[PDB]
Motif scaffolding. Structure first.
Motif, PDB file in Angstrom:
ATOM      1  N   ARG B 112       0.764  -1.223  -0.051  1.00 33.95           N
ATOM      2  CA  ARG B 112       0.079   0.057   0.015  1.00 33.95           C
ATOM      3  C   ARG B 112       1.043   1.281   0.029  1.00 33.95           C
ATOM      4  NH1 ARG B 112      -3.058   2.389  -1.728  1.00 33.95           N
ATOM      5  NH2 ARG B 112      -4.499   3.410  -0.065  1.00 33.95           N
ATOM      6  N   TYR B 116       0.762   4.128  -2.758  1.00 29.58           N
ATOM      7  CA  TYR B 116       0.829   5.622  -2.666  1.00 29.58           C
ATOM      8  C   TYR B 116       1.826   6.461  -3.199  1.00 29.58           C
ATOM      9  CZ  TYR B 116       2.127   9.272   0.279  1.00 29.58           C
ATOM     10  OH  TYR B 116       2.655  10.869   0.670  1.00 29.58           O
TER      11      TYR B 116
ATOM     12  N   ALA D  67     -18.768   5.675   5.736  1.00 29.72           N
ATOM     13  CA  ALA D  67     -18.169   6.884   5.943  1.00 29.72           C
ATOM     14  C   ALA D  67     -17.474   6.965   7.173  1.00 29.72           C
ATOM     15  CB  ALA D  67     -19.481   7.873   5.842  1.00 29.72           C
ATOM     16  N   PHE D  68     -16.032   7.440   7.003  1.00 31.07           N
ATOM     17  CA  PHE D  68     -15.227   7.715   8.036  1.00 31.07           C
ATOM     18  C   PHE D  68     -14.998   9.262   8.263  1.00 31.07           C
ATOM     19  CE2 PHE D  68     -10.834   8.222   9.736  1.00 31.07           C
ATOM     20  CZ  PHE D  68     -11.018   7.793  10.908  1.00 31.07           C
ATOM     21  N   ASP D  75      -6.171  12.339   9.884  1.00 28.99           N
ATOM     22  CA  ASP D  75      -7.488  11.286   9.822  1.00 28.99           C
ATOM     23  C   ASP D  75      -7.342  10.788   8.422  1.00 28.99           C
ATOM     24  OD1 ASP D  75      -7.622  12.864  12.055  1.00 28.99           O
ATOM     25  OD2 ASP D  75      -9.708  13.276  11.686  1.00 28.99           O
ATOM     26  N   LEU D  78      -5.177   7.653   7.959  1.00 34.12           N
ATOM     27  CA  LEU D  78      -5.415   6.587   8.515  1.00 34.12           C
ATOM     28  C   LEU D  78      -6.131   5.509   7.679  1.00 34.12           C
ATOM     29  CD1 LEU D  78      -6.703   8.095  12.054  1.00 34.12           C
ATOM     30  CD2 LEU D  78      -5.708   5.664  11.651  1.00 34.12           C
ATOM     31  N   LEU D  79      -6.552   5.886   6.925  1.00 36.91           N
ATOM     32  CA  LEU D  79      -7.413   5.052   5.513  1.00 36.91           C
ATOM     33  C   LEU D  79      -6.328   4.483   4.624  1.00 36.91           C
ATOM     34  CD1 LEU D  79     -10.828   7.237   5.249  1.00 36.91           C
ATOM     35  CD2 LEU D  79     -10.438   5.082   6.812  1.00 36.91           C
ATOM     36  N   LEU D  80      -4.962   4.424   4.985  1.00 39.76           N
ATOM     37  CA  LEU D  80      -4.055   4.021   3.945  1.00 39.76           C
ATOM     38  C   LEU D  80      -4.483   2.511   3.641  1.00 39.76           C
ATOM     39  CD1 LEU D  80      -1.526   4.111   2.095  1.00 39.76           C
ATOM     40  CD2 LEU D  80      -0.565   3.171   4.310  1.00 39.76           C
ATOM     41  N   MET D  81      -4.757   1.554   4.666  1.00 38.44           N
ATOM     42  CA  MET D  81      -5.018   0.202   4.521  1.00 38.44           C
ATOM     43  C   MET D  81      -6.407  -0.270   4.335  1.00 38.44           C
ATOM     44  SD  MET D  81      -1.911  -0.519   4.522  1.00 38.44           S
ATOM     45  CE  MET D  81      -1.916  -2.318   4.514  1.00 38.44           C
ATOM     46  N   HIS D  82      -7.321   0.814   4.278  1.00 37.50           N
ATOM     47  CA  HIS D  82      -9.007   0.655   4.420  1.00 37.50           C
ATOM     48  C   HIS D  82      -9.343   1.596   3.332  1.00 37.50           C
ATOM     49  CE1 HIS D  82      -7.761  -1.282   8.092  1.00 37.50           C
ATOM     50  NE2 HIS D  82      -7.432  -0.123   8.395  1.00 37.50           N
ATOM     51  N   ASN D  83      -8.714   1.932   2.106  1.00 36.80           N
ATOM     52  CA  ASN D  83      -9.412   2.419   1.114  1.00 36.80           C
ATOM     53  C   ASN D  83     -10.396   1.778   0.098  1.00 36.80           C
ATOM     54  OD1 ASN D  83      -7.234   1.046  -0.193  1.00 36.80           O
ATOM     55  ND2 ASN D  83      -7.397   2.382  -1.873  1.00 36.80           N
ATOM     56  N   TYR D  86     -13.427   2.037   3.275  1.00 33.67           N
ATOM     57  CA  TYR D  86     -14.048   3.238   3.995  1.00 33.67           C
ATOM     58  C   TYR D  86     -13.832   4.500   2.987  1.00 33.67           C
ATOM     59  CZ  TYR D  86     -14.486   1.241   8.550  1.00 33.67           C
ATOM     60  OH  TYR D  86     -14.974   0.497   9.661  1.00 33.67           O
ATOM     61  N   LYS D 105      -4.396  14.971  -0.316  1.00 35.53           N
ATOM     62  CA  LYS D 105      -3.738  13.878   0.144  1.00 35.53           C
ATOM     63  C   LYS D 105      -4.768  12.373   0.002  1.00 35.53           C
ATOM     64  CE  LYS D 105      -0.587  13.577   2.133  1.00 35.53           C
ATOM     65  NZ  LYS D 105       0.572  13.297   1.292  1.00 35.53           N
ATOM     66  N   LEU D 109      -3.817   8.745  -1.822  1.00 38.81           N
ATOM     67  CA  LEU D 109      -3.946   7.540  -1.100  1.00 38.81           C
ATOM     68  C   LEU D 109      -5.163   6.642  -1.836  1.00 38.81           C
ATOM     69  CD1 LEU D 109      -4.214   9.005   2.654  1.00 38.81           C
ATOM     70  CD2 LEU D 109      -2.278   7.661   1.698  1.00 38.81           C
TER      71      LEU D 109
END
Lengths: 135, 149, 329, 124
Positions: B112, B116, D67-68, D75, D78-83, D86, D105, D109
């Motif tokens: 990931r 990115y 929705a996050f 914040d 934080l959603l790098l692994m959960h794109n 979320y 940003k 991501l």
RNA sequence: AAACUUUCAGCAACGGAUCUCUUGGCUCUCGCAUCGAUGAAGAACGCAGCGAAAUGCGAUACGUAAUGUGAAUU
RNA sequence: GCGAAACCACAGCCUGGGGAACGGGCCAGG
RNA sequence: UUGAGAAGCUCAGACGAGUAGGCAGGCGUGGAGGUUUGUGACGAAGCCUUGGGCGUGAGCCUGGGUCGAACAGCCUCUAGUGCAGAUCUUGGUGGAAGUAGC
RNA sequence: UUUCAAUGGCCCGUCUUGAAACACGGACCAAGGAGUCUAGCAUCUAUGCGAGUGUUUGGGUGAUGAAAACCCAUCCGCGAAGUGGGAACGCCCUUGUGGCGUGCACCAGAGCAUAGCUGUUGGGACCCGAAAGAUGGUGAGAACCAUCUAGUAGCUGGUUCCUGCCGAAGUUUCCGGAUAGCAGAAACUCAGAUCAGUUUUAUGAGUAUGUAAAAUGAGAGUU
RNA sequence: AGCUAAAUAUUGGCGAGAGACCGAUAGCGAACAAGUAGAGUGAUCGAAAGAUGAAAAGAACUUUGAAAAGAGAGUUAAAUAGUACGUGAAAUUGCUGAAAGGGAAGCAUUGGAAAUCAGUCUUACCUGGGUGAGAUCAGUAGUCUCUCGAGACUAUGCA
């Protein structure tokens, strides 16, 4: 304050329940199941036991105390009435400062329930005891 | 240590926790997954590994229990190669005889973080319109001045 | 058990010294977040001032009437806690301050601190100027916490700022000393820094908010006196008459060490699977699905239903006696 | 596991349309004689646990994402692994300066933003 | 159709909720001991700035003297 | 020209029935 | 196989009216300790809206408009903490009605 | 979202009584508006210590906020002075046998303190609704005013978010209650055992009725 | 027969510091004029009423009208801040636009029509060559910080 889980908020009681949940599930010992059940009980259902009663119960009738560990899920208080304490190995949730000193200074060892689980993971050669529930 | 640490941070209060409707999150910088879990916690795991990005380069951060009491020297990092195949090998060889769950999580974060960096470079080459903020006071003024004009 | 034996001392220039202090027994005390929170809840009510409406004031529904059950001053404002419970919570809050992970989870920016517990020299006790205090905090990299507190100063949300509570911020490091020969005045103007004597530790300072793990900087003398303030589980405290550190109902709190030990893993039965595979998700009818029929009945392969037993020599069997009875009346 | 809603209409309080003093926020009727509590025919429905939605698809937007809430660039990261699970939703009180920083940003991501066009203009 | 009636929306009225504010209240604690026939508390009438439904003052009438601060009052 | 107050759950065409008034409010009709 | 918030994950079967009453888990409000190195004149709070979304629900998030200085999430503490009724209190405003009338 | 078409669809809250009905309350909207605080007692839970336990009447102390926190001298309050059977060992292919039995039921102290919850008794005591009466005055028997006084309604009216789970009785007996019974919690033991709005076998008594021991279903008995 | 400090009490008086208190229908009846206006022969009873803006910069001037005011203008960051002044909800009222109309009605279910709205985009991936590039590559030289090698850089070359 019973059944599924303890109502107590002590994190260290929750860790003991964690240990004996595994032991009661991954072994075939009714001792581990019995210990787990009593870990869930309330303070009223876990009456304290005394140093005198442990000494009396171990050397009872036929005596032959040998070296079996005494396990009580509760407090081991002290009986100042008795003058000489035998050599006892006791595992308990708690020991009072008087009871612990008297066992150690003239006698054997005081253990916690996790130290007991390492020595006797199946509960073998243990004397599981209870206190008088009638207050 | 770890079990007592988790019972405090994991169930009473952690300043890194973000409570969510379906899953709690961890704003800690060293969390591999970004979720609040027992295995994801960098606080409650004394042997932890993560992959982090520093000014365009990826690093494998590792900490051991024997440096827990020295916060300045707690985490050690190695530079991960730009070759993705070799970066996986470096994670494998630095995390040798670690649990496979932890090597699995670092390899997922490496992917990931590599994606990115790829997307960031592709946005730099591309041309995209600038986002102009709308100013409420300026909008009110020009709306009333226009009516008079 | 099996804690780190000694603690290093750091000079006023931020460099490690050759002197170490044995870790006091209070850092081995049980960490009791439930028990610290309960004592903090009570102790935080012990400085409240009474409030009440005027007696002459004022139906609770009528305008300019009397409020239902008017507030009274003789409400219970102060709450008692057993002195042993207060000492247990304070011992448990000193122990939590020695864990770097609990410090991070309480918001302290100790990511560059050289050691936890952080002990400095006794020359710090005689600092006279805030410049000396700030320089020391920058040499041991503890100034990141102060910068955090300074950046966190906001206006309070609500009526609190109408009531002499204008601003809010964070808690910085807690400097603990033995004797005050300048240390208190050198550090008191630094935002977030609190200075307390080691003899009178406060649970409102050791667990602010009821949250364990405050960042604490000790002087060498304060650290050496921690064993007299608290004592051990077997030796009485010198400065607290008849006080012993609490014992824990568990010996090694690492329960994964016990569960995954050779003592226990050598007797447990072979572990079943993790999340198991689903068996019989769908019910298939053997009268329609021929593959399920062959599974249940290993005989339908050789059945031979329609066998022929008759021929062209059928002996019609009905006597004249039976026919007469049938064809009667 | 596509998103299925057992019901899309809201549960309006009984007699909330008749009276302006009565809000439409659901209130459980307590009158024994009331036909709504007795659940007669033709009357309005009541919130029951059977109306609850699938646990796997619960909280999921029509595009399959949850929705996050996001208030700064911390914040979003934080959603790098959960794109894929979320979507970022910038808070309503985040200024147009921070909204721009969040949106750039989130774009790198690969994170979907629910309200990425708010309070800003475009200039190509 | 139109009118009227009804519904919805926009604008304009009406109203003064909500929010934010606060030289106010309330409550607790702390220090102190000082009315009058040498005319008190209270009341009345005047004075001069005023907005008095306020304040200050007493025919020396926003006070005079003295000690100041030091250039305004508005 | 000036100018109220009481009152106000809500609409409001009849014949029959709806058993506890059923009616104005249901059912079947005009 | 990574699916140890062991307070997690997972498999299976059955069941589902409900007054009084009993027991759990949650939503929201004012203030307090901690925290988010939190939001805010590049617009906080409130308000409006046939904008959008989330939750069985209490409720919550958000776009636009209006607006102009403060405010929130999480852990805990606290209470003058949630309304359609009381021929309720205070205030505002209707139909009667431009009627009875002067 | 507005409207149309087809189908259905009464006005809520209270009280009543068998549910009703009926009679009450409701012109509209906003704001306010009702189980609170405290002193006892008992229960349960949590926590500390434990034959003990309880610092805060007070003293010490607190250099920076000092009504906090910290420490405790002498007293004092309360407290105290045969079988079955859980678990474990060793044999038995296993069952099972043998030795050893805690708690409890049959024939060697456990308390004290704090907190929360629940119940209950007092304080205005969930809110509101009838005039008392008395004391002291004003005006001219009666009237009027202010306080005791939150003196009151066996009652009247009202009493504020959500979801989930459990769930009655609505009546035997003596006689406002002790009950029982229905519905839950806790403490148990117990399938190598019992229980049943059930049917039986045959004979006992008088097709019905009753009986001990078969069929069917369910693990049951309890305090 | 008599005196007598201290420890004690204190809703008043002269001051002072506070608060997990109330936040203009709240908190004192009184945040302003407040025991005031007002009511009563009198004893007594007794309110409602806070906020323009940073600055009055409080709208000059022209014009219609008997006047109140209006309209052109003008000030302000804003007059959707004009003293009937922060924000400006609901009930209610007027005008305009659209739609529906015949009496239980509103409402519930399902769709139509009209109006309107929402998000979902192909773009990247893989592979080959050419051209140059640079380091985490040098059969390479130095510095710094940590614990040989780990990070950060500095030259030099681009196989």
């Amino acid at each position: 304050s019973q059944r599924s889980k303890p109502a107590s908020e002590n994190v260290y009681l929750k860790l003991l329940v964690k240990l004996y949940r595994f032991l009661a599930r991954r072994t075939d010992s009714r001792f581990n199941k019995a210990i787990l059940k009593r870990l869930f009980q309330s303070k009223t259902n876990r009456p304290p036991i005394s140093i005198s009663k442990i000494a009396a119960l171990t050397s009872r009738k036929s005596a032959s105390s040998q070296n079996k560990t005494t396990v009580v899920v509760g407090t081991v208080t002290d009986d100042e009435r008795m003058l000489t304490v035998p050599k006892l190995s006791i595992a308990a949730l708690r020991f009072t400062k008087s009871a612990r000193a008297r066992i150690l200074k003239a006698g054997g060892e005081v253990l916690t329930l996790d130290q007991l689980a390492l020595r006797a993971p199946t509960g073998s050669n243990t004397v599981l005891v209870r206190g008088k529930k009638h207050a | 240590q770890d079990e007592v640490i988790w019972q405090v941070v994991g169930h009473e209060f952690c300043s890194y926790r973000i409570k969510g409707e379906a899953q709690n999150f961890c704003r800690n910088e060293y969390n591999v997954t970004g979720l609040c879990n027992r295995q994801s916690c960098p606080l409650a795991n004394s042997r932890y590994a993560t992959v982090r990005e520093d000014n365009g380069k990826l690093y494998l951060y590792m900490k051991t229990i024997e440096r827990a009491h020295f916060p300045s020297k707690l985490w050690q990092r190695i530079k991960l190669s730009k070759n993705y195949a070799k970066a996986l090998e470096q994670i494998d060889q630095q995390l040798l005889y670690w649990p496979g769950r932890q090597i699995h999580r670092c390899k997922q974060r490496l992917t990931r973080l590599t994606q990115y960096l790829l997307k960031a470079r592709r946005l730099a080459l591309k041309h995209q319109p600038a986002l102009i903020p709308i100013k409420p006071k300026q909008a009110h003024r020009e709306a009333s001045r226009e009516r008079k004009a | 058990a099996a804690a780190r034996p000694t603690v290093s001392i750091y000079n006023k220039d931020g460099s490690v010294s050759s002197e170490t202090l044995a870790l006091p027994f209070v850092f081995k005390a049980p960490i009791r977040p439930d028990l610290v929170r309960s004592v903090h809840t009570a102790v935080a009510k012990n400085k409240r001032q009474p409030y009440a409406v005027s007696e002459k004031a004022g139906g609770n529904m009528c305008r300019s009437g009397r409020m239902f059950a008017p507030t009274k001053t003789w409400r219970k404002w102060h709450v008692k806690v057993n002195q042993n419970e207060k000492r247990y919570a304070i011992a448990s809050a000193v122990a939590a301050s020695g864990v770097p992970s609990l410090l991070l989870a309480r918001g302290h920016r100790i990511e560059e601190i050289p050691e936890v517990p952080l002990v400095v020299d006794d020359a710090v006790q005689s600092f006279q100027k805030t410049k000396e205090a700030v320089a020391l905090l920058k040499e041991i990299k503890a100034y990141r916490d102060v910068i955090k507190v300074a950046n966190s100063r906001k206006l309070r949300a609500g009526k609190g700022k109408l009531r002499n509570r204008r601003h809010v911020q964070r808690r910085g490091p807690l400097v603990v000393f033995n004797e005050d020969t300048g240390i208190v005045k050198a550090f008191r103007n630094i935002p977030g820094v609190e200075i307390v004597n080691v003899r009178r530790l406060n649970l409102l300072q050791l667990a602010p908010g009821g949250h364990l793990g405050r960042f604490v900087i000790w002087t060498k003398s304060a650290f050496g006196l921690l064993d007299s303030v608290f004592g051990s589980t077997t030796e009485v405290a010198q400065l607290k008459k008849n006080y012993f550190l609490p014992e824990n109902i568990i010996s090694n709190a690492d329960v994964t060490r016990l569960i995954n030990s050779d003592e226990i893993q050598s007797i447990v039965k072979a572990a079943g699977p993790s999340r198991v595979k689903r068996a019989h998700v769908q019910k298939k009818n053997p009268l329609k699905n021929k593959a399920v029929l062959s599974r249940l009945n290993p005989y339908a392969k050789a059945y031979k239903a329609n066998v022929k037993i008759n021929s062209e020599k059928t002996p019609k069997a009905a006597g004249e006696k039976f026919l007469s009875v049938l064809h009667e009346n | 596991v596509n998103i299925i809603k057992k019901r899309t209409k809201p549960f309006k309080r009984h007699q909330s349309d008749r009276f302006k003093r009565v809000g439409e926020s659901w209130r459980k009727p307590r009158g024994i004689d009331s036909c709504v509590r007795r659940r007669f025919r033709g009357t309005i429905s009541m919130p029951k646990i059977g109306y609850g939605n699938n646990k796997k698809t619960r909280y999921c937007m029509p595009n399959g994402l949850k929705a996050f809430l996001v208030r700064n660039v911390s914040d979003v990261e934080l959603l790098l692994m959960h794109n894929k699970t979320y979507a970022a939703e910038i808070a309503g009180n985040v200024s147009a300066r921070k909204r721009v920083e969040i949106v750039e940003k989130a774009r790198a991501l690969g994170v979907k933003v629910t309200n990425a066009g708010a309070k800003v203009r475009s200039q190509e």
